[PDB]
């Protein structure tokens, strides 16, 4: 978990109704919310403050309140000149990513109606090839008439973000680098055809996300199974199911870092 992502999503439905929400993340793990009623940061865990003082965090909180209102208003002002374009939605992903012995990554990326619009490279706002003249002319504005904004973004993603991320990772090591063991079980039901029998090996409640669940005849893997998606539980753990179709004659393995080199073997009948 080496990257802090602060996301915004801005929805412009009418020239009278637009809306801004945002959150902070270690990958899939949410560390921060935003109460738009009060314009405040929600610290979801008691380590969500990292090594930063209340004063540094209050200062950032107000910057975000002003930005959220300001970006929303600046867009609403340019868009209300053509009610035809509504509704539309703008997304922002900003943050950083650490790599031992390297300069940290810093990024600020923007989407418009679900597609890349533009991003921040070095000190320049570069348009997406795919967003054509819209992207091009928005980048001209930011590069020529929002240098104050550019300097703020640079500093946030290249100076503040790495510092914050290190403090956040340090404060929450135990939870982020925790091991939680999967419960595993087998179940049966008829198929809608073919062999007419579905064997389902399940694993749920494991953390972290790397996991290996493969059906196996003797010590030999059994190919041709349907691998599920690794899906989230509300506790941050994950779920996975793997399906072997059979014509019903006569084992599913479960591997995870939390099992300390002792896999879970279920046999079935």
């Amino acid at each position, epitope marked *: 978990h080496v990257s802090f992502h602060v996301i915004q999503i801005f929805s412009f439905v009418n020239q009278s109704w637009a809306r801004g929400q945002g959150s902070g993340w270690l990958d899939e793990l949410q560390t921060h919310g935003w109460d738009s009623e009060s*314009g405040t940061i929600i610290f979801l865990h008691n380590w969500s403050k990292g090594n930063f003082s209340n*004063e*540094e965090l209050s*200062d*950032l909180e*107000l*910057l975000f*309140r*002003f930005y959220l*209102f*300001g970006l929303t*208003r*600046e867009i609403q002002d340019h868009a209300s000149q053509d009610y035809s374009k509504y509704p539309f939605e703008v997304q922002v992903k900003a943050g950083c990513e650490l790599h031992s012995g390297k300069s940290p990554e810093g990024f600020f990326q923007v989407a418009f109606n679900g597609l890349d619009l533009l991003s921040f490279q070095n000190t320049t706002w570069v348009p997406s090839p795919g967003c054509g003249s819209l992207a091009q002319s928005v980048c001209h504005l930011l590069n020529h*008439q*929002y240098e*104050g*904004v550019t*300097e*703020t973004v640079y*500093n*946030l993603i290249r*100076s*503040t973000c790495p510092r914050f991320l290190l403090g956040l990772l340090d404060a929450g090591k135990m939870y982020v680098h925790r091991q939680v063991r999967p419960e595993a079980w087998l179940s049966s039901r008829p198929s809608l055809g073919s062999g007419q029998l579905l064997l389902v090996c399940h694993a749920s409640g494991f953390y972290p996300k790397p996991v290996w669940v493969t059906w196996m005849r003797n010590e030999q893997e059994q190919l041709g199974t349907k691998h599920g998606d690794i899906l989230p539980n509300a506790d941050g753990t994950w779920y996975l199911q793997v399906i072997l179709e059979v014509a019903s004659e006569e084992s599913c393995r479960v591997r995870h870092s939390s099992l300390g080199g002792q896999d879970i073997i279920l046999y079935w009948g």
Partner: T-cell receptor
Amino acid sequence: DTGVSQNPRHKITKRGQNVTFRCDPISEHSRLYWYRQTLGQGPEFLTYFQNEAQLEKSRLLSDRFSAERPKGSFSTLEIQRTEQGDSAMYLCASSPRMVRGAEAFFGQGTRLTVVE
Amino acid sequence: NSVTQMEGPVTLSEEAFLTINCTYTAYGLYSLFWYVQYPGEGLQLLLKATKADDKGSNKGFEATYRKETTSFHLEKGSVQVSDSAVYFCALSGQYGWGKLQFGAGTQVVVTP
């Protein structure tokens, strides 16, 4: 050079009375601040308007104090039930939209004297 | 308050070197400023520095944004009687987007 305009320039009020101060920022300044200043001290922040939206008030702001900027332009500041300690210079400042490190343009203030 | 400036008054004669000390506690990419209030007048900006190591200059007054010493000292080589005023150090937080936060002010009295 038409700068920030504040009215009235001075105001005496009897303790217990309400007063309303007015500020007209520099044309189109999106950012508007109200501060309070007592002789011998620097301006103390009261509240900040971005356009019409009041995005920050001082934590120590009294419930007696309320400000408004209904059209993102002129602002009003009302103090209810004045007290001697409310006596001070009430400063309005405006700053341009989208300029970092911006200068704050101060008015000449409403000088408030609360008398018994 | 995160802006602390020299207690005044500072009294010196015309042609003397003036120094008003100002220290601050701030975060990220803040901006520093010096405001001046001449007798019977409103506040107005004297000089400003938006980025680290930027020197703000105006009418012989100068102040350098010095991160590593947390300083925005106001200097003027050779003061004139008309420089008699109150000087306020100030800090815009929210990475230079926020309200000015002022020090208490330092009165300068320049004697003939």
